[PDB]
From a paper:
To obtain an architectural overview of [name], we carried out structural studies on modified [name] [name] constructs in different nucleotide-loading states. For these constructs (collectively denoted as RNF112T), the N-terminal RING domain, the predicted transmembrane helix, and the C-terminal amphipathic helix were removed. RNF112T is composed of a GTPase domain (GD) and a middle domain (MD) comprising a 3-helix bundle.
Nucleotide-free RNF112T contains several disordered regions in the nucleotide-binding site in the GD, involving all G1-G4 motifs, which take up as much as ~15% of the total GD in terms of the number of amino acid residues. Thus, the disordered G1 motif of [name] in the nucleotide-free state makes it unique in the dynamin superfamily, representing an extremely flexible catalytic center before binding nucleotides. The MD of nucleotide-free RNF112T stays perpendicular to α8G and swings ~30° from the position of GDP•AlF4−-bound RNF112T MD when the GDs are superimposed. Compared to the GDP•AlF4−-bound form, the Hinge 2 loop in nucleotide-free RNF112T involutes toward the GD from the outstretching conformation, leading to an ~90° rotation around the long axis of the MD. Accompanied by the wedging of the MD into this groove are extensive interdomain contacts. Met456, Met458, Phe459, and Ile462 from the MD; Phe452 and Pro455 from the Hinge 2 loop; and Ile280, Ala284, Tyr308, Met311, Met315, Phe441, Val444, and Leu445 from the GD form a massive intramolecular hydrophobic network. Therefore, the interdomain contacts are unique to nucleotide-free [name] and stabilize its specific conformation. Given the similarities with other dynamin superfamily members, a special structural feature of [name] is seen at its nucleotide-free state, which is characterized by a 30° rigid-body swing of the MD relative to the GD and a new intramolecular interface between the two domains.
Residue numbers in the entry: 148 to 193, 198 to 219, 230 to 233, 240 to 335, 344 to 381, 397 to 544
The structure:
Amino acid sequence: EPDHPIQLVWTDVNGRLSLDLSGAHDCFLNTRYSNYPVFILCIIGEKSFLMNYIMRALRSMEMDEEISFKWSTKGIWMWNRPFLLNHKGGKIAVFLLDTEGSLDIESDRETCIKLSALSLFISSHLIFNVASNLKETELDYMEMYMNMGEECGPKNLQHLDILVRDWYVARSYISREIEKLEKLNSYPKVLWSLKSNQTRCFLLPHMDEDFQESLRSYVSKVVKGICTHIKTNIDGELLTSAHVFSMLQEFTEVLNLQIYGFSSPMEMFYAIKNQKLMGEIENEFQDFLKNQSSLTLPPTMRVKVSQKFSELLEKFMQFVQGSNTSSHDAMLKDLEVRLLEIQEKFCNDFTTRF
């Protein structure tokens, strides 16, 4: 079939994330490039011009030519074939990803956050389209993305480009946003990113030729820096499309299992870490109970299990992340119900057996 965009992920009627497994398999586990170092360019927010220029520039570098089969929706879409760019004596497989979603509509916000989080999780580089100054919801997506690099290798940096489509000077723009963020005292990683030039801002004029040339200039700049921003995984191997297929499956499951309320991307991110912490506590309780002797005096056993139980609820509140207390309360209550099940099983076994 002629190469075309494929919808990788969408949301079903229940807000669950659904993955085209067979489709993603075909793209990512192709025996030609699946062990080539991979690069996932992702576009988010709100284009056809930008996307088509990126493909035209990529297809030129692929055929060893010089930079100077089109792109058409509420999901994650990918161009089903990668562009193989020369690097070392090998190749880099560039996949092109587009996150279609609302940014500010309050309907289906949890699902919008989930789709976007998934794209950001697997991206090597983010192109974020904004209209004028950065709004809070955009900045929160940006902070989530900045946090997704802190768990993907040691010297991993998260690269973000901001395409401001309707500002009215890119110097005054970035300086302005740095000032607003400095007073707000929130979004510390975006602030740091803006000050370290890891986040770049590009201002696009609205007339055709000035927009055309600015897009061309920007697209040339990001395809040229692709080969030097290869991500490495936790192990230290360069990211490959096989790895990306695995990450996509696993983080889709993590997102569908994040069953606690959240109103913002950072809250969804902290909810994911807090659920993990819950499981580290329950496992820690199970281990503690397994190491207790069957010879222990039943009274001394009851007190030790009770105090350990209490200490673990304290530990959940000490290491819980984020500031949504309503969510922490729901999770502690569920942790308490789970710990009491482990306790009831161990204790009821212990009393009747011994």
